[PDB]
Design a protein around this ligand. Structure first.
Ligand code: B12
Ligand code: SF4
Ligand code: SF4
Ligand code: NI
Ligand code: NI
Lengths: 442, 424, 313
C-alpha cells in the first residue's frame, strides 16, 4: 500500500482514474486496478514496481462475454487467511470415439442441468473435446456441439499439432482452451496460440518435467498457460495438484503460478460417486478446472452448493435472499418468523424448523446482512424495520394467523413491535437455537 | 469453613420471572406505582463492603409498602441500596454488578426499570400487585441471582429498598453520590503508566481470525463496548473467556508502545498471524482491525497528518476513498500501516498516535463527528499547549472535500501538523 | 524447483474407542490430511454407520427398503450393519430420548444401549439428543449401563460437560466428545474446561460442528482448517485432539437429499442425491482435518472408504 506510494509521483492528477495517488496506491496493492493506469510513473520506479506488485499467480480468462470465466489469481492456501478469488469450473468430457446417442445424452444433460441458487447461475461451464484418433469424426463432434446451442466454453484436448491446426479455427473465436503442449510439440503449439492469446495447456510426466517444460514456454515469451498436474493415480494427482500451489505460493515461485486443469473422468474411470468426492476434494485443494465424465443433478446439487460456500469472501458475510421464505407448503393461515438474513442464522433456524411439522412462513426483514444483535446495535433490525417489512412483503394476505414470532435475543422490540402492529400477536423466544421448536408447537 | 455454597433454583417471587418479559409495555392506565423519573427521586447503588456490614439474605423495606398506595396510580421515592461482600470482590466490579441490575428488574412481569444511578425510574403494574407483589420481592430477585451470575466474586448480598422521602435523600448523599464520584474519577484519571497489566480480547476472531484487541486504560476496544475495567471484570467472572491478562513486562520502546510480552501474547492469540505490534503508532507495526470500528483514521501524506471518517459518513474523504472503501482494507485483522480502525472515544486520548507526533496530526473530520468530540478534543489538545479551540483549526466536510483545498485551509490556519516533522 | 519442506512442531493425540481387536485409533498425524508427501499421517480416518433406537420414520424410502426386517429391533439392526457392511464404528442415536418428540425416561434408553453394546464387537458411539439438560441425565445412566466396553459419548457441550464428562471419562472409563459451535476459540475453550476438570487430551475427542454442503459449509471448513493449523503449526496443546464430525446427521436432512421424484421430478433419483450429498460433505470435511465421519447410507460408506484408501495408498 504505502510501499508503492513512495514510488508514486504524488501529483493527484487523476490520470489513473482514481482521485488521489494514495487511492491508486492502496488499490493496486490489492491488485484490482494494477499498475498500467498511471502514465506519469518514472521508468526508474516503473520497472521496480512492475515486478514487486506482479501477482504470484496469473489469472487466465477463457471464453467470450457470457461464458467469461477467470481461473487462478489465488494468493492464500486457506480461505480463512484471505478470500479465495476465482471459483473452479466443471467440464464434461467429449471424445470423438463416442456414439451419437451417447453424445446426445451428454448434450441434453448439460442443457438440462441449469438452475439459480442464491442468485448465481449454476451450470456446466466448459465442454472438453478430446481427440481419440479419428480426425474426421473430431471436427464433426466440434461442429455438432456448436449447433446444439449449449452455452458452454470450449477446451480442445488434442496433442496432435496437425489435428489441432484444423480444429482450432472452428472455435478459435470463442477464446477456447488449447490443451496439448508437451515436451516435443510446445514450440509448434506456442506459435499456434501466440497470435490470438489463447490459454495453452502444459503436459509432462512429473513435477520436475512439468517445471522444466513451463520454463521453455516462458522462455519463448508466452505466459498465458493452464498447467496440468497430471498423475498415474489419484494419490499422485492429488500430490501434484497440491505441490504446484504450495511451490507457487509458499515458495514464491512464479513458474508454477498458473491454474491447474484436472481430468477427473480418467482417474475415477467414469465413477459418479467417486467423481463427486474428488470434485469436492479438488475444490478445496487447488483444482481450478475439473473435467468430469457427465453432468447430472446428483453431481450438480452438492458440488455447486459447496463451491458457492467455499469461494465466498469471509470478510463479506454470506447473505440469503430477501422477502418471505415460506417453509413446507405455504398456505393461507400460519404464524410467521423473523430473521436477519445473515444466512447462518437462517440456516441454523431453518435447520431446526426443517422438520416441517408446524408450517411457518419466515419473513426476513432487511437487517443489513448482519447477525441479530449487531443488526439491532446498528439500528437495522428495529421495530420500524420489522413493521414496515410486513407492509413491504404483504404477509397479512398470505397468512391469516396474527401469531408473530421474533428472534429471542431481540427483547425491547417486543413492546415496540406491539405498538406498530397492534392486531399482530408477538411471541418473544429465548436466544438459544434449541427453543425454536418449543414455541413452534404453539 | 469448607467454602461450600448452596444454589437456589427458584426465585421466591409469585410473579413469573423470565428473560422474555423484558421489553414489555405497561398500559398508561394500568400502572400502579411510578417510582422516580423527573417526577420523584429514585436511585440504585451496588456497594463492596466488608463481610461484617453485609448479612446474607437480608431484605429491608424502609417506608410505606406497595400495599399502602390503594388510590389512583401515584409516585413514591425509591432507593435500592445493595451491599455486596466477597473474598475477591473489589470496587472495580461494582459497575458490572450495577449494570446487570437493569436487566434483573426488567425480567419481572409488570416491572420495567430504565436508567442508571439517580436517573432511574421503575413502574409497577397492577398485574403484579394483585398477585402479592411487594417491595420485599424486589430484594429477593436481586439477591437470588446476584449470587447466581456473580457466584465467584459475591459471597453475601444485602438489599435494602428505601421508599421514605427523608431517608431516600439522606442515604443518596452518603453512599450514592460519593460513590459515583469514585467511578468517574477512576475512569478519567487512569492512564497506561499507572496500570501494570493490559488485557486482550478475541471475540471478533469469528470473522477476523488474525485480530487481537489490546485494551489499555487509554485505548479501549475498537467496537467501543469493551474498556480496561470491563475486560478486568470479564477475566474475573469468566477466566476462560475472551478477555485475558497481558503483563506489561519488557519495554522495547516506550514512545511507540513496544513491549516484549505484548508481542509474545499477540503471536499466541492470533495463532502466529501477527508477531510484532505497536500500541501508540499507525506506521510501524500497527494494531489490526476487525470491522466493528465506527471511525477509521487514514494517513494523508500531502497534509503531514491523518484524516478521519466515521461509519455513518457516506461521502468521500479527502483521501479519495469512502468509509466502505477504507474498511475493505483496514478490516479483516490485517496489519496495514498508515490506516487504523478505532473507536469513537479513542480520538481524544493522550495515546492517540503518541508515536506519530500526537493528537495534532488530525486535519480533517466529518462535521457531525467533530462536534461530538469537540469538547474532549479541545481539552486534550490544550495539553499540547496550542490554543484551546483545536477543533476550529480542524477542517470539516462543509469547508472542503478535496486534498488541495484542505491543504490551503491548513496553511492559513497555522495548523500544528504542518510544522511537525514529516510523518512519512 | 524447491520441494515444499513444511515442518510442523505439533502432533495430534491418539484416542482409542472400543475394546478388543476391533478398537480403533484416531489422530496421530503431524501433517495436513492426506499429505503423505509431507510426513506421517498417524491413523487413517474412520468411517462409521448410523442406526437409531426407534424405527426410522423420516428416512428416505430406499433406506427403509434396506433395513426392512432389522430396523424394528436396534439389537438386530446393529448386528445386521456389522455383519453386512463392517463399519469402523456404529453410531446409536437415541432419538427416543429427545423432549421434542417421543420423550422417554433415560432408564429406558440406557437399557436399549446396554443390549446393543453387548451384541456387537465394533466400537459403539452413543449419540444423545439436542437438549443439553436431558443429555446430562441421559448419559449418566447410559454410561453406567454400558460399563466395560469403552463407548464414545457424543455431544457434551459446555453446559453439560461437567455432568457428561464426570459420568463419562472419569467415572466409568469411557470417551467423551467435546462439542463446540463452528469456532476455534469455543473449541479451544471447551477443551480447556475438560483439561481443568481432570480429563487430558487422550480421553476426549473434539466436535467443531458439522453442516451439509451448501448450508453453512464454509464455516465448518474454516474451523477445521484453523484448528488443524493451530494444533500443528502453532503446537497448541489445547487443540491437539482428534476430530469427529457426524455427516449423516446434517447432510441427509436437506431438501436436495430428501425430496423424492414426485416432489422434484427434474432432480432425478432420490437415492443418488442422498448418497451424493453425504459423499460430497464427508470428503470435504475429511480433507479439512476430520479423523472420523458418521454416514447413513451403506453406499456412501463404500465410496468414502475407497476415497480414503485411494489417497493414502
Ligand atoms: C460478527 C460481529 C460483528 C460483525 C458482523 C459480521 C457478520 N459476520 O455478520 C460486524 C463487524 C458487522 C459487527 C459490528 C458491530 N458490532 Co458486532 N458482533 C459480532 C459478534 C462477534 C458475533 C455475532 C454473531 O454471529 N453471533 C452469533 C449468532 C448466531 O447469533 P444470532 O445472530 O443472535 O442468532 C441466534 C439467536 O438470535 C437465535 N434465533 C434467531 N432467530 C430465532 C428465532 C427463534 C424462534 C428462536 C427460538 C431463536 C432464534 O438463534 C440464533 C442461533 O443461535 C458479536 C459477539 C457476541 N458476543 O455476540 C459482536 C457484538 C454483537 N457486536 C457488538 C457491537 C456493539 C457492534 C457495533 C454496533 C459496534 C459499533 N460500531 O459501535 C458494530 C455495528 C456495525 C455497523 N454496521 O453499524 C456487541 C453488541 C453490544 C450491544 N449491546 O449492542 C458485541 C457483543 C461485541 C461486544 N463488544 O461485546 N459485529
Ligand atoms: S495517474 Fe499517477 S499521479 Fe495521477 S493521480 Fe493516478 S497515481 Fe497519482
Ligand atoms: S473489537 Fe471489541 S468485541 Fe471485537 S475483539 Fe476487540 S474488544 Fe472484543
Ligand atoms: Ni471487533
Ligand atoms: Ni471490528
Amino acid at each position: 500500500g504505502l510501499n508503492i506510494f513512495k514510488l508514486t509521483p504524488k501529483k493527484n492528477c487523476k490520470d489513473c482514474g482514481f482521485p488521489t495517488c494514495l487511492a491508486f496506491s492502496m488499490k493496486v496493492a490489492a491488485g484490482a486496478v494494477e499498475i498500467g493506469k498511471c502514465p506519469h510513473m518514472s521508468d526508474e520506479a516503473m520497472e521496480k514496481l512492475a515486478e514487486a506488485t506482479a501477482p504470484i499467480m496469473k489469472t487466465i480468462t477463457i471464453g467470450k462475454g457470457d461464458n467469461e470465466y477467470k481461473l487462478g489469481g489465488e494468493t492464500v492456501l486457506f480461505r480463512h487467511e484471505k478470500t479465495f478469488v476465482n471459483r473452479n469450473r466443471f467440464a464434461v468430457a467429449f471424445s470423438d470415439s463416442m456414439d451419437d446417442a451417447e453424445v446426445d445424452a451428454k448434450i441434453q444433460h448439460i442443457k438440462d442441468v441449469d438452475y439459480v441458487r442464491i442468485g448465481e447461475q449454476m451450470k456446466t461451464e466448459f465442454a472438453a473435446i478430446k481427440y481419440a484418433g479419428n480426425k474426421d469424426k473430431y471436427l464433426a463432434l466440434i461442429n455438432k456441439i456448436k449447433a446444439s446451442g449449449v452455452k458452454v466454453a470450449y477446451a480442445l484436448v488434442c496433442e496432435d499439432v496437425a489435428v489441432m491446426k484444423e480444429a482450432l479455427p472452428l472455435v478459435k473465436d470463442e477464446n477456447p482452451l488449447v490443451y496439448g503442449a508437451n515436451k516435443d510439440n510446445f514450440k509448434e503449439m506456442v506459435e499456434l496460440v501466440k497470435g490470438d492469446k489463447l490459454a495453452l495447456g502444459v503436459k509432462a510426466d512429473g513435477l520436475e518435467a512439468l517445471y522444466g517444460l513451463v520454463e521453455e514456454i516462458q522462455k519463448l515469451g508466452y505466459k498465458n498457460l493452464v498447467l496440468d498436474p497430471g498423475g498415474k493415480s489419484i494419490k499422485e494427482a492429488f500430490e501434484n495438484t497440491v505441490q504446484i500451489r504450495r511451490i507457487n505460493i509458499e515458495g514464491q515461485d512464479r513458474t508454477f503460478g498458473y491454474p491447474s486443469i484436472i481430468f477427473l473422468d480418467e482417474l475415477t474411470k467414469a465413477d459418479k460417486f467417486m467423481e463427486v468426492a474428488l470434485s469436492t476434494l479438488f475444490t478445496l485443494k487447488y483444482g481450478s478446472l475439473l473435467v468430469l465424465s457427465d453432468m447430472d443433478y446428483s453431481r450438480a446439487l452438492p458440488l455447486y452448493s459447496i463451491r458457492q460456500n467455499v469461494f465466498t469472501d469471509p470478510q463479506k458475510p454470506m447473505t440469503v435472499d430477501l422477502g418471505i421464505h415460506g417453509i413446507n407448503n405455504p398456505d393461507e393461515n400460519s404464524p410467521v418468523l423473523c430473521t436477519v438474513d445473515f444466512a447462518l442464522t437462517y440456516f441454523l433456524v431453518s435447520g431446526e424448523v426443517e422438520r416441517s411439522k408446524v408450517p411457518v412462513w419466515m419473513v426476513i426483514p432487511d437487517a443489513g446482512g448482519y447477525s441479530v444483535l449487531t443488526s439491532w446495535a446498528a439500528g437495522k433490525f428495529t421495530g420500524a424495520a420489522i413493521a414496515d417489512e410486513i407492509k413491504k412483503c404483504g404477509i397479512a394476505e398470505k397468512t391469516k394467523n396474527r401469531t408473530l414470532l421474533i428472534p429471542g435475543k431481540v427483547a425491547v422490540l417486543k413492546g415496540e413491535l406491539e405498538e406498530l402492529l397492534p392486531d399482530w400477536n408477538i411471541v418473544i423466544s429465548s436466544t438459544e437455537a434449541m427453543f425454536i421448536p418449543k414455541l413452534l408447537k404453539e | 469453613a469448607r467454602n461450600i455454597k448452596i444454589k437456589i433454583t427458584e426465585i421466591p417471587i409469585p410473579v413469573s420471572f423470565a428473560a422474555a418479559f423484558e421489553g414489555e409495555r405497561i398500559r398508561k392506565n394500568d400502572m400502579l406505582a411510578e417510582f422516580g423519573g423527573n417526577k420523584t427521586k429514585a436511585w440504585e447503588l451496588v456497594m463492596c463492603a466488608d463481610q461484617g456490614e453485609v448479612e446474607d439474605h437480608k431484605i429491608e423495606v424502609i417506608g410505606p409498602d406497595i400495599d399502602t398506595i390503594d388510590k389512583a396510580p401515584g409516585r413514591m421515592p425509591l432507593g435500592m441500596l445493595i451491599k455486596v461482600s466477597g473474598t475477591n470482590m473489589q470496587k472495580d466490579f461494582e459497575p458490572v454488578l450495577e449494570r446487570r441490575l437493569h436487566y434483573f428488574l426488567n425480567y419481572i412481569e409488570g416491572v420495567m426499570h430504565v436508567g442508571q444511578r439517580n436517573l432511574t425510574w421503575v413502574r409497577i403494574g397492577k398485574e403484579a400487585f394483585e398477585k402479592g407483589f411487594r417491595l420485599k420481592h424486589f430484594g429477593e430477585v436481586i439477591y437470588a441471582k446476584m449470587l447466581d451470575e456473580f457466584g465467584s466474586v459475591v459471597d453475601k448480598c444485602e438489599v435494602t429498598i428505601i421508599t421514605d422521602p427523608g431517608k431516600a435523600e439522606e442515604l443518596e448523599g452518603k453512599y450514592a453520590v460519593p460513590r459515583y464520584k469514585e467511578r468517574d474519577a477512576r475512569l478519567e484519571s487512569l492512564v497506561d503508566e499507572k496500570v501494570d497489566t493490559f488485557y486482550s480480547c478475541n471475540l471478533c476472531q469469528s470473522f477476523a481470525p488474525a485480530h487481537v484487541c489490546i485494551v489499555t486504560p487509554e485505548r479501549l476496544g475498537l467496537c467501543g463496548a469493551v474498556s480496561w475495567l470491563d475486560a478486568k471484570a470479564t477475566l474475573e467472572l469468566n477466566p476462560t473467556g475472551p478477555c485475558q491478562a497481558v503483563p506489561k513486562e519488557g519495554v522495547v520502546d516506550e514512545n511507540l508502545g513496544i513491549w516484549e510480552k505484548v508481542n509474545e501474547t499477540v503471536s499466541k492469540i492470533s495463532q502466529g498471524a501477527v508477531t510484532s505490534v505497536t500500541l501508540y503508532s499507525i506506521l510501524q507495526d500497527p494494531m489490526t482491525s476487525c470491522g466493528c470500528f465506527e471511525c477509521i483514521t487514514g494517513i494523508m501524506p500531502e497534509a503531514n497528518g491523518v484524516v478521519m471518517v466515521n461509519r455513518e459518513f457516506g461521502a468521500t474523504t479527502p483521501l479519495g476513498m469512502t468509509f466502505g472503501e477504507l474498511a475493505s482494507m483496514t478490516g479483516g485483522g490485517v496489519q496495514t500501516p498508515g490506516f487504523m480502525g478505532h473507536g469513537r472515544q479513542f480520538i481524544a486520548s493522550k495515546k492517540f498516535m503518541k508515536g506519530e507526533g500526537g493528537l495534532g496530526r488530525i486535519v480533517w473530520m466529518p462535521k457531525e463527528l467533530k462536534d461530538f468530540v469537540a469538547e474532549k478534543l479541545n481539552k486534550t489538545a490544550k495539553e499540547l499547549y496550542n490554543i484551546d479551540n483545536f477543533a476550529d483549526m480542524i477542517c470539516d466536510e462543509t469547508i472542503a472535500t478535496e486534498s488541495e483545498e484542505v491543504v490551503k485551509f491548513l496553511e492559513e490556519k497555522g495548523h500544528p501538523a504542518l510544522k511537525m516533522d514529516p510523518i512519512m | 524447483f524447491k520441494k515444499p519442506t513444511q515442518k510442523f512442531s505439533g502432533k495430534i493425540g491418539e484416542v482409542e474407542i472400543g475394546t478388543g481387536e476391533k478398537a480403533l485409533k484416531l489422530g496421530g498425524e503431524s501433517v495436513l490430511p492426506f499429505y503423505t508427501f509431507d510426513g506421517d499421517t498417524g491413523n487413517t480416518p474412520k468411517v462409521g454407520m448410523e442406526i437409531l433406537d426407534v424405527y426410522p420414520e423420516d428416512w428416505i424410502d430406499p433406506l427403509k427398503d434396506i433395513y426392512k426386517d432389522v430396523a424394528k429391533d436396534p439389537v438386530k439392526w446393529a448386528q445386521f450393519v456389522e455383519e453386512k457392511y463392517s463399519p469402523d464404528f456404529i453410531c446409536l442415536r437415541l432419538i427416543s430420548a429427545d423432549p421434542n418428540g417421543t420423550d422417554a425416561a433415560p432408564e429406558d434408553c440406557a437399557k436399549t444401549a446396554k443390549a446393543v453394546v453387548e451384541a456387537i464387537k465394533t466400537p459403539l458411539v452413543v449419540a444423545g439428543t439436542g437438549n443439553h439438560e436431558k443429555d446430562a441425565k441421559l448419559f449418566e445412566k447410559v454410561a453406567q449401563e454400558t460399563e466395560g466396553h469403552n463407548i464414545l459419548l457424543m455431544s457434551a457441550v459446555e453446559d453439560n460437560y461437567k455432568s457428561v464428562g464426570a459420568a463419562g471419562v472419569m467415572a466409568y472409563n469411557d470417551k467423551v466428545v467435546a462439542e463446540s459451535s463452528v469456532d476455534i476459540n469455543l473449541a479451544k475453550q471447551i477443551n480447556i474446561l475438560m483439561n481443568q476438570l481432570g480429563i487430558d487430551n487422550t480421553k476426549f475427542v473434539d466436535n467443531v460442528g458439522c453442516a451439509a454442503g451448501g448450508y453453512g459449509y464454509e464455516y465448518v471448513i474454516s474451523t477445521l482448517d484453523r484448528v488443524k493449523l493451530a494444533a500443528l503449526g502453532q503446537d497448541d496443546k489445547t487443540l491437539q485432539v482428534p476430530i469427529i464430525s457426524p455427516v449423516s446427521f446434517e447432510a441427509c436432512k436437506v431438501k436436495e437429499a430428501m425430496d423424492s421424484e414426485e416432489d422434484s421430478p427434474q432432480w432425478g433419483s432420490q437415492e443418488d442425491r442422498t448418497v451424493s450429498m453425504e459423499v460430497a460433505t464427508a470428503s470435504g470435511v475429511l480433507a479439512s482435518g476430520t479423523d472420523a465421519v458418521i454416514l447413513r447410507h451403506p453406499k456412501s460408506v463404500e465410496v468414502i472408504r475407497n476415497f480414503i484408501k485411494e489417497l493414502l495408498g
